[PDB]
Amino acid sequence: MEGMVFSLKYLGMTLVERPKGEELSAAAVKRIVATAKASGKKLQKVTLKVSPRGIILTDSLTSQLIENVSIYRISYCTADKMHDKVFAYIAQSQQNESLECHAFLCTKRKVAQAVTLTVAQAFKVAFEFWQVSLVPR
């Protein structure tokens, strides 16, 4: 799997209490979107690079790393039903056991779907590396 790049806008994050499920992500995305709309600020432009290794988030203006999210930390991803331009993932924090939903605004529903499908491929290919005791690449 070649690493795929998307240039999105970061809506923000909220904690969730379980790692997987649409009930969780739907409510998280509702919260994050309402907070971003009330912010009165333009969203940070972020680039996502998706591969079986995980998701690399970089600030688009500076190309500086925000976070390299290991594939083993990410439990779930979604193209949201209600807020259909939003792609989100849930991942456990690197530094403790808390679970965070991070949401990104795409230009179009089709892009949110493409990002979700690309992340699904990364989960599948990482799993296949894992089964044969190889490092995901």
Binding site: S25, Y76, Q92, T116, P136
Partner: peptide, 13 residues
């Protein structure tokens, strides 16, 4: 919605 669970979540040993 289109949604996916990661089968390798937390599968570090």
């Amino acid at each position: 919605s289109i949604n996916f669970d990661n089968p390798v979540y937390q599968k570090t040993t």
